[PDB]
């Protein structure tokens, strides 16, 4: 079935405080979470794959183009991370 995703809703501080990997063709994954973030105070973890954020599709996008879409989200204001712990997929790429 398609399986039970997390919403992850944080404030954006100077940083969204998070490492990327994979691309294209497997999902963009949660590579790190640095414990000085609000990402990783809402329960994004380090193998969770990103789905979405703030309505914008990531199953799509290449890993260059999510980075620039985290730097760019507005500083101070709230975003809105759908996502899915995928582990096992996830200790292939890295």
């Known amino acids: 079935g398609p399986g039970s995703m997390k919403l992850v809703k944080f404030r954006k501080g100077d940083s969204v405080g998070l490492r990327l990997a994979g691309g294209n063709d497997v999902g963009i994954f949660v590579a790190g979470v640095l414990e000085d973030?609000?990402?990783?105070?809402?329960?994004?973890?380090?193998?969770?794959?990103?789905?979405?954020?703030n309505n914008v599709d990531f199953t799509n996008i290449i890993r260059e183009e999510a980075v620039l879409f985290l730097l760019d989200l507005p500083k101070g204001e709230e975003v809105t991370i759908l996502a899915q712990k995928k582990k096992d997929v996830y200790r292939r790429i890295v």
Not at 39 to 48: I, P, Q, S
Request: glycine share 12%; net charge negative.
């Open 37 to 53: 973030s609000p990402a990783a105070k809402e329960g994004l973890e380090e193998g969770d794959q990103i789905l979405r954020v």
